[PDB]
Amino acid sequence: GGAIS
Amino acid sequence: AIQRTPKIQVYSRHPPENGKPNFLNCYVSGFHPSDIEVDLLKNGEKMGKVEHSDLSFSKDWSFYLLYYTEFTPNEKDEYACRVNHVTLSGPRTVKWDRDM
Amino acid sequence: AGSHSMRYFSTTVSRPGRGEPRFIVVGYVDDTQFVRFDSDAASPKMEPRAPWMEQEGPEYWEEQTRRVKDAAQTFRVSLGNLRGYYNQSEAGSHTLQTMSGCDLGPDGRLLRGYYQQAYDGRDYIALNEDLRSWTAADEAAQNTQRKWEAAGVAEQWRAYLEGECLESLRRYLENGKETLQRAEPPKTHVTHHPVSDHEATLRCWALGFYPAEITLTWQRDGEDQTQDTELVETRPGGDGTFQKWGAVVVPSGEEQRYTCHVQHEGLPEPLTLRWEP
Ligand SMILES: *C(=O)CCCCCCCCCCCCC
Ligand SMILES: [Cl-]
Ligand SMILES: [Zn+2]
Ligand SMILES: [Zn+2]
Ligand SMILES: [Zn+2]
Ligand SMILES: [Zn+2]
């Protein structure tokens, strides 16, 4: 989802 | 980055019979990265109307693609799949073996 | 079948100097593809790739397209951060792949949920089976792990994987039941090709089967000839079914000592074949 690395 | 060389299988959808419409398949798998060039060849020449599957990959993250097109096999005509990928010294050409 | 799976496989590939990274997603129920997205398409949207998907209404397609476009942006930003973590040039192409999905067990519960990423073809980070912790594959990925632990990312995946993931899978299984729930047994036969006056290739064929999982072995005197068998990778027919073969080269006079054994979930019981001239 919105979880950027 | 890792690189893996493509495996290549060339084959028909149904058992081949002369004069009967069929599908010619070139299944290319186990490669990385994803950029790859695949041509189906009739008597050495590039076939048109070749379609391919949507890019997917396996458990080890290596990619696979099916390239395919309609064909009607006859004894005169030779078929092959030619694959180029960064992991290769040059394009690899695999001839269709119709008698397995 | 007692258990089923859903998976989304996404690939993001940067192309320095040539625009935004390309983003491709495909979704599978078991071994059947049902959707795709490609950011390079004329007007990128989530699209059906199985006919039983066509009955989903436009709001389904709008939401899936929104979610994929969201992911695409996330993954483009991620590619930037990862090139930082790895101290890499902006000149080179790199690849981010993600797998996510759920297995539905026969008790109607989550058999296992998945979310994993790879960078340039190597494991990067994975959600553990417990859906509460992470495995980082290297120090760079520990950057991500730390960010994701702080942000409670695992719990968000756990909620998805136990809820909507399974609900979606159940719905697809119902909508596509006539093909998704039908295990098609392999059509099998043995071919024979002399390689000389003294030896022949025995080839055991399995054709038109679904799903793709199958075991094909040659045996001689009740023992697997695995280290003498050429076994090709299971391959798509192109019509939703799969194909495989395995071959052994044998002395002509001992051809009848060899039997091919085929296991498939579509078979009542394992098949045993032989060369029958
Ligand atoms: C963030 O990392 C986006 C991951 C998408 C979560 C799945 C939501 C369900 C819809 C399927 C979209 C799959 C996009 C890869
Ligand atoms: Cl996009
Ligand atoms: Zn194309
Ligand atoms: Zn089932
Ligand atoms: Zn709307
Ligand atoms: Zn032969």
Side-chain angles (χ1 to χ4, degrees):
Chain A
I4 282 110
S5 283
Chain B
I2 58 93
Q3 298 181 305
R4 328 208 246 301
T5 58
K7 295 175 185 168
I8 300 156
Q9 297 192 63
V10 191
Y11 58 101
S12 55
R13 172 177 304 176
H14 309 288
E17 302 184 341
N18 289 322
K20 308 278 186 47
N22 205 329
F23 285 85
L24 179 65
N25 292 337
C26 182
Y27 182 58
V28 184
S29 62
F31 60 95
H32 213 289
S34 54
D35 277 354
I36 195 162
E37 286 175 312
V38 179
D39 268 310
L40 287 187
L41 302 178
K42 175 176 181 187
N43 299 316
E45 312 164 15
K46 283 186 277 191
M47 306 179 63
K49 294 177 180 177
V50 180
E51 293 186 276
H52 60 81
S53 57
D54 305 320
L55 188 74
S56 190
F57 50 85
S58 307
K59 187 193 175 67
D60 63 2
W61 303 105
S62 64
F63 299 101
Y64 59 86
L65 289 168
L66 171 72
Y67 283 74
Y68 59 95
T69 189
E70 310 179 325
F71 83 126
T72 299
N74 286 123
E75 223 84 65
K76 49 175 206 83
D77 300 318
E78 276 289 306
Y79 292 93
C81 181
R82 188 179 60 224
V83 177
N84 188 216
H85 189 259
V86 61
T87 64
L88 296 172
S89 315
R92 180 161 301 162
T93 299
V94 175
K95 300 181 179 197
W96 179 48
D97 185 345
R98 78 197 65 197
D99 186 35
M100 324 203 72
Chain C
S3 308
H4 290 280
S5 61
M6 186 172 67
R7 299 280 188 278
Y8 287 86
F9 303 115
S10 80
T11 305
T12 308
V13 182
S14 64
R15 42 190 167 195
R18 304 191 285 153
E20 297 259 282
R22 188 189 184 172
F23 187 54
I24 296 166
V25 191
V26 295
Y28 281 85
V29 168
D30 297 323
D31 297 315
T32 299
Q33 195 190 337
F34 70 103
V35 288
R36 74 168 175 204
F37 174 97
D38 184 348
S39 65
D40 275 8
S43 181
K45 56 183 205 309
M46 194 74 101
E47 292 180 325
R49 294 287 280 155
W52 45 264
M53 280 302 295
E54 297 176 28
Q55 71 195 288
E56 295 281 358
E59 288 297 322
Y60 170 85
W61 299 104
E62 293 169 31
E63 176 65 6
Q64 296 302 294
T65 295
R66 181 188 76 77
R67 287 184 185 181
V68 168
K69 285 188 178 184
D70 180 58
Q73 284 311 107
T74 294
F75 291 150
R76 292 180 173 124
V77 170
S78 296
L79 270 176
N81 293 354
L82 262 59
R83 158 201 91 232
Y85 300 159
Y86 287 108
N87 194 27
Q88 287 170 334
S89 167
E90 291 196 38
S93 175
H94 296 278
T95 299
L96 176 66
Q97 291 161 271
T98 74
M99 182 273 284
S100 63
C102 45
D103 295 335
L104 175 73
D107 63 351
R109 295 191 58 242
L110 179 65
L111 191 52
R112 183 157 184 180
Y114 310 82
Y115 181 50
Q116 332 192 340
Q117 289 187 348
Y119 182 65
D120 288 338
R122 312 200 143 265
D123 286 350
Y124 182 75
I125 197 172
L127 186 68
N128 294 321
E129 176 152 10
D130 54 65
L131 309 186
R132 301 167 173 288
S133 62
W134 305 93
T135 296
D138 62 29
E139 285 207 358
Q142 293 183 321
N143 290 296
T144 298
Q145 181 174 2
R146 285 186 289 272
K147 288 190 190 169
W148 285 5
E149 286 166 347
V153 164
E155 159 155 30
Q156 287 167 303
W157 276 102
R158 192 167 60 256
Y160 168 72
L161 295 166
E162 285 178 347
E164 188 189 5
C165 190
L166 286 177
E167 296 167 1
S168 290
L169 172 53
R170 289 182 192 105
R171 181 172 74 258
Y172 304 147
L173 284 168
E174 182 57 32
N175 284 349
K177 65 182 164 198
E178 283 76 14
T179 49
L180 297 172
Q181 295 280 16
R182 163 67 174 155
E184 191 57 42
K187 289 150 206 54
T188 62
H189 71 284
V190 177
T191 57
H192 156 286
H193 317 288
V195 294
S196 70
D197 295 341
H198 301 281
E199 291 175 301
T201 303
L202 303 183
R203 186 166 287 107
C204 185
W205 284 90
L207 297 169
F209 56 93
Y210 184 88
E213 195 52 43
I214 197 173
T215 310
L216 196 163
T217 65
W218 273 105
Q219 283 188 344
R220 178 205 184 120
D221 299 326
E223 155 171 52
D224 298 334
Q225 304 293 304
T226 322
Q227 62 180 302
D228 283 287
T229 306
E230 183 181 9
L231 188 64
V232 299
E233 207 169 62
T234 305
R235 65 197 197 189
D239 60 355
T241 72
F242 295 87
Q243 307 180 352
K244 196 184 193 65
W245 62 249
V248 61
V249 176
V250 305
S252 302
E254 300 180 325
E255 291 175 15
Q256 295 309 311
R257 293 247 271 266
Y258 287 86
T259 57
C260 180
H261 304 259
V262 179
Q263 294 166 268
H264 191 261
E265 68 168 56
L267 290 170
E269 53 147 351
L271 285 179
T272 289
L273 296 78
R274 72 177 51 260
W275 168 228
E276 294 176 351

